[PDB]
Design an enzyme around this catalytic site. Structure first.
Site, PDB file in Angstrom:
ATOM      1  N   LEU A 137       0.883  -1.172   0.000  1.00  0.00           N
ATOM      2  CA  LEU A 137       0.000   0.000   0.000  1.00  0.00           C
ATOM      3  C   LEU A 137       0.915   1.214   0.000  1.00  0.00           C
ATOM      4  O   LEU A 137       1.998   1.163   0.572  1.00  0.00           O
ATOM      5  CB  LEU A 137      -0.874   0.019   1.263  1.00  0.00           C
ATOM      6  CG  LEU A 137      -2.033  -0.984   1.365  1.00  0.00           C
ATOM      7  CD1 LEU A 137      -2.636  -0.956   2.775  1.00  0.00           C
ATOM      8  CD2 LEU A 137      -3.096  -0.634   0.331  1.00  0.00           C
ATOM      9  N   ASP A 138       0.492   2.294  -0.651  1.00  0.00           N
ATOM     10  CA  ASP A 138       1.298   3.512  -0.671  1.00  0.00           C
ATOM     11  C   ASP A 138       1.566   4.000   0.744  1.00  0.00           C
ATOM     12  O   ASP A 138       0.819   3.697   1.679  1.00  0.00           O
ATOM     13  CB  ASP A 138       0.603   4.658  -1.414  1.00  0.00           C
ATOM     14  CG  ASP A 138       0.619   4.487  -2.908  1.00  0.00           C
ATOM     15  OD1 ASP A 138       1.484   3.744  -3.430  1.00  0.00           O
ATOM     16  OD2 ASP A 138      -0.226   5.118  -3.579  1.00  0.00           O
ATOM     17  N   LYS A 139       2.630   4.782   0.873  1.00  0.00           N
ATOM     18  CA  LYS A 139       3.044   5.371   2.139  1.00  0.00           C
ATOM     19  C   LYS A 139       1.902   6.045   2.901  1.00  0.00           C
ATOM     20  O   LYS A 139       1.724   5.816   4.100  1.00  0.00           O
ATOM     21  CB  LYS A 139       4.147   6.396   1.875  1.00  0.00           C
ATOM     22  CG  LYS A 139       4.535   7.260   3.058  1.00  0.00           C
ATOM     23  CD  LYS A 139       5.532   8.323   2.603  1.00  0.00           C
ATOM     24  CE  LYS A 139       5.911   9.272   3.724  1.00  0.00           C
ATOM     25  NZ  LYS A 139       6.876  10.316   3.257  1.00  0.00           N
ATOM     26  N   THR A 157      -1.363   5.702   2.188  1.00  0.00           N
ATOM     27  CA  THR A 157      -2.628   5.004   2.017  1.00  0.00           C
ATOM     28  C   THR A 157      -2.694   4.119   3.262  1.00  0.00           C
ATOM     29  O   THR A 157      -1.687   3.532   3.665  1.00  0.00           O
ATOM     30  CB  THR A 157      -2.637   4.152   0.727  1.00  0.00           C
ATOM     31  OG1 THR A 157      -2.712   5.019  -0.417  1.00  0.00           O
ATOM     32  CG2 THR A 157      -3.836   3.187   0.715  1.00  0.00           C
ATOM     33  N   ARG A 171      -5.425   5.927  -7.351  1.00  0.00           N
ATOM     34  CA  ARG A 171      -5.121   7.348  -7.348  1.00  0.00           C
ATOM     35  C   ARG A 171      -5.041   7.940  -8.759  1.00  0.00           C
ATOM     36  O   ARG A 171      -5.609   9.004  -9.014  1.00  0.00           O
ATOM     37  CB  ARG A 171      -3.808   7.602  -6.600  1.00  0.00           C
ATOM     38  CG  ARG A 171      -3.847   7.269  -5.107  1.00  0.00           C
ATOM     39  CD  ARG A 171      -2.446   7.312  -4.508  1.00  0.00           C
ATOM     40  NE  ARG A 171      -1.868   8.644  -4.571  1.00  0.00           N
ATOM     41  CZ  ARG A 171      -0.596   8.923  -4.308  1.00  0.00           C
ATOM     42  NH1 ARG A 171       0.248   7.951  -3.964  1.00  0.00           N
ATOM     43  NH2 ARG A 171      -0.175  10.177  -4.378  1.00  0.00           N
TER      44      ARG A 171
END
Length: 250
Positions: A62-64, A66, A161
């Protein structure tokens, strides 16, 4: 790739897997700009024996900024089966998000994604990129924002995103794909303030479902949206109620 004393929110753990609820400001795997301080470092500290597992058991990321659920493998057999289950799309993760703009329908974004030519830390939709499919449904309407739930068929870097931004509905707070535009007209002070403070994409992996890699038993976990998104939603909801009060006493 050294162990680091970084607290993890473990939702579930058995002999083979670990389920964590990842907070914001936390990169999953070391990379350009983030040599350490990641989930991988935190896992090496929490369970050193995981070092013998490829990528320290990390099967998906998962993104930083998110937030949400992710499963981690504790053994090689579990990791190999989880990766296979993932590729066979047998691991379901549902996300909650708040997008900019009033949307009138759920749908699907089926647009190829590729690395941005100019920007090195950006992704972009392009016809010659690689296949990507994002499904979304409208959970709740706001005046100029929309609360969504999403499920994916592919899971590429920044997919949700960049997909949402492509259809002119970037996630609120997203500092890369246009999620921080000027506040809407008729916005209260608290609304303008809350929007100003929300500096991350409004995206959370609220549900994770999979078949245990060893027992094969189907399992599912839920993670409520973080407090920051709760406050964001509460003020948008307040704004929409005030908006709908326009002629209710006329």
């Amino acid at each position: 790739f050294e162990p680091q004393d970084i607290p993890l929110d473990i939702v579930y753990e058995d002999e083979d897997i670990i389920i964590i609820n990842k907070p914001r400001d936390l990169v999953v795997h070391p990379g350009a700009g983030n040599p350490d301080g990641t989930v991988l470092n935190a896992l090496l500290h929490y369970y050193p024996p995981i070092a013998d597992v490829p990528r320290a058991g990390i099967v998906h990321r998962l993104d930083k900024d998110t937030t949400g659920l992710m499963v981690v493998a504790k053994t090689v057999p579990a990791q190999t089966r989880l990766v296979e289950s993932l590729q066979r799309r047998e691991i379901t993760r549902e996300y909650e998000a708040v997008a900019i703009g009033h949307m009138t329908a759920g749908g699907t974004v089926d647009e190829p994604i590729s690395r941005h030519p100019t920007k090195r830390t950006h992704m972009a939709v392009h016809p010659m990129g690689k296949p990507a499919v994002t499904h979304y449904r409208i959970m709740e309407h706001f005046r100029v924002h929309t609360r969504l739930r999403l499920r994916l068929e592919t899971g590429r870097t920044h997919q949700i995103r960049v997909h949402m931004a492509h259809i002119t509905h970037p996630l609120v707070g997203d500092p890369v794909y246009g999620g921080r535009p000027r506040p809407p007209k008729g916005a209260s002070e608290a609304f303008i303030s809350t929007l100003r403070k929300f500096d991350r994409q409004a995206l959370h992996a609220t549900m994770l479902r999979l078949y245990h890699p060893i027992s094969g038993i189907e399992m599912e976990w839920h993670a409520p949206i973080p407090q920051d998104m709760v406050e964001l939603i509460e003020v948008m909801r307040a704004d929409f109620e005030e908006h709908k009060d326009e002629v209710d006493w006329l």
